[PDB]
């Protein structure tokens, strides 16, 4: 069975630091690409970051974030930094159909529960 977990997140001061994680347990780790989606209240899902064979980021990341996948633990991290208050939203974790990343939400078939992140 394919299932995913997530890190804590939690409240973070404006301009602070935070790290997320997502462990892929069921399927093989070196045969799929993982990516993170955010869903602000009253808005649809959109791409944030994703690591296949080459990193990708959204238009609003502007290099603030950093994404890397540890092959040993079979997890993908997200070294977010300097979180503006507009970034508050629920950050999901999803696995792509294959080793490529597509910005549309319909390119993934195994989502996560969702991690709550807020900035004040």
């Amino acid at each position: 069975e394919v299932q995913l977990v997530e890190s804590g997140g939690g409240l973070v001061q404006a301009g602070g630091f935070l790290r997320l994680s997502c462990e892929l347990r069921g399927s093989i780790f070196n045969q799929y690409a993982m990516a993170w989606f955010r869903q602000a209240p009253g808005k649809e899902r959109e791409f944030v970051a994703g690591m296949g064979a080459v990193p990708h980021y959204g238009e609003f990341v502007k290099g603030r974030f950093t994404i890397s996948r540890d092959n040993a633990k079979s997890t993908v991290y997200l070294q977010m930094s300097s979180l503006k208050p507009e970034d508050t939203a629920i950050y999901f974790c999803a696995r792509s159909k294959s080793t490529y990343i597509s910005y549309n939400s319909n390119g993934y078939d195994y989502w996560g529960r969702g991690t709550q992140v807020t900035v004040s």
Partner: protein, 451 residues
């Protein structure tokens, strides 16, 4: 009235199951010695016209979306490509700082920063001496570090082996046959939408010519449908599932690389050779592809008409260009003559349909190295091919991904997509399933075993 039980060995009955298949390759090419991928030197030779015998009064249900042969086939290709790269040579010595600059031999205005002329020191056959060789690398295979100081893009993630010149990447058909005790069914209904009972099912010891083709979208050289362009899906209501459109009449596509590349040999060490692009002869022209304007518009007409049976008749169906993301999903990466292409497709999926001669030209890009779909880590190096590479192919199907719009706003937008690399074969293994025979059944009759 008293009747007894009996057991009938060798009775025809089967149950769904899975197992491991094996070689079936044509013996015509055996004489042509080629220890390439998808090997024939190590196989059971195929059989001419296998025992394809029809069945009557039989009803069987197929389900390709949960088929095991496609999953089994995938692990086969993964385990094969790795085996074919072991005897090749690594590229660890080549990860060196490069001094590069633009190349301008009256280059065309279409591309300016596409070819970089790089020179780097390198160890010769004798380690005491060193040589200053030069080569031309595409702009997608070099990054700046700090001016002119570039390195190969893959020299900080994972080194990878050169593609052996001996092996070839062209598609060799691979028939699949079940082992003793098993049998492979084969549906034959023309109006077969992937799932559901198939009335005229027939058995065969071996599948027809199956050529696995490495493509993301617009899968090439597929098996044409008989009639009535089909739309095979899993949960068409859900938009997260792909839609493998397969049409009967194929549209021919011509792809060429007008650049007159010349190969140059450089010695990695004792007995280890590395090939690099030499000097481009003649003018430089962007690699492109062509598809007939008239046929393509008609082909989309069939797909749109056949797609309305699921979304009503008063629906504004309009196509849109690719999604946007990894370079291997935005374009379609198809192998052609040993070189990997990346062809922009925004010129095809651009139109809108209401329910009331010329040739399309599109650009393409080429990458010498590729992060192979087999695994995330290892890359690959594609040696240059001399002369001009041109290859024609049959575009037989499409891989469309629907857009998750609102229930209102009946304009439903489809986008080309893919990259799964399992759906490519699923379009060719949608007819077959593997079954296990279970002899020695039990039936009632009348006997008395004499003592």
């Amino acid at each position: 009235e008293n009747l007894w039980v009996t057991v009938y060995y060798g009775v025809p009955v089967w149950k769904d199951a899975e197992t491991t298949l094996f070689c079936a390759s044509d013996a015509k090419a055996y004489e042509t010695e080629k220890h390439n991928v998808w090997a024939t030197h190590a196989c059971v030779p195929t059989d001419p016209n296998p025992q394809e015998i029809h069945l009557e009064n039989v009803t069987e249900e197929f389900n390709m979306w949960k088929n095991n042969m496609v999953e089994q086939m995938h692990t086969d290709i993964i385990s094969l490509w790795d085996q074919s790269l072991k005897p090749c040579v690594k590229l660890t010595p080549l990860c060196v700082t490069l001094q590069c600059t633009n190349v301008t031999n009256n280059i065309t205005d279409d591309m300016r920063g596409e070819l970089k002329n790089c020179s780097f020191n390198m160890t010769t056959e004798l380690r005491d001496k060193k040589q200053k060789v030069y080569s031309l690398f595409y702009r997608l295979d070099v990054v700046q570090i700090n001016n002119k100081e570039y390195r190969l893009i893959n020299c900080n993630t994972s080194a990878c082996t050169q593609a052996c010149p001996k092996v070839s990447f062209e598609p060799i058909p691979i028939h699949y046959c079940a082992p003793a005790g098993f049998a492979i069914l084969k549906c034959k209904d023309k109006k077969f939408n992937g799932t559901g009972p198939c009335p005229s099912v027939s058995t065969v010891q071996c599948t027809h010519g199956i050529k696995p083709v490495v493509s993301t979208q617009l899968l090439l050289n597929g098996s044409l449908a008989e009639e009535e362009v089909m739309i095979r899906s899993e949960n068409i209501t859900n938009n997260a599932k792909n839609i493998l459109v397969q049409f009967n009449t194929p549209v021919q596509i011509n792809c060429t690389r007008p650049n007159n590349n010349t190969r140059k040999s450089i010695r990695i060490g004792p007995g280890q050779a590395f090939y690099a692009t030499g000097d481009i002869i003649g003018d430089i022209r962007q690699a492109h592809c062509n598809v007939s304007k008239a046929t393509w518009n008609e082909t989309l007409g069939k797909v749109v008409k056949q797609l309305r049976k699921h979304f009503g008749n008063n629906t504004i169906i309009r196509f849109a260009n690719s999604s946007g993301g990894d370079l291997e999903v935005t374009t379609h990466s198809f192998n052609c003559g040993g070189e990997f292409f990346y062809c922009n497709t925004s010129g095809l999926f651009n139109s809108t349909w209401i329910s009331n001669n010329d040739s399309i030209t599109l650009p393409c890009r080429i990458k010498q190295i590729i992060n192979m779909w087999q695994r995330i880590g290892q890359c690959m190096y594609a040696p240059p091919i001399q002369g001009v590479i041109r290859c024609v192919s049959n575009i037989t199907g499409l891989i469309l991904t629907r857009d998750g719009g609102s229930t209102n706003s009946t304009t439903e937008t489809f986008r080309p997509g893919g990259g799964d690399m399992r759906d490519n074969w699923r379009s060719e293994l949608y007819k077959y399933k593997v079954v296990k025979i279970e002899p020695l059944g039990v039936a009632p009759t009348r006997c008395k075993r004499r003592v």
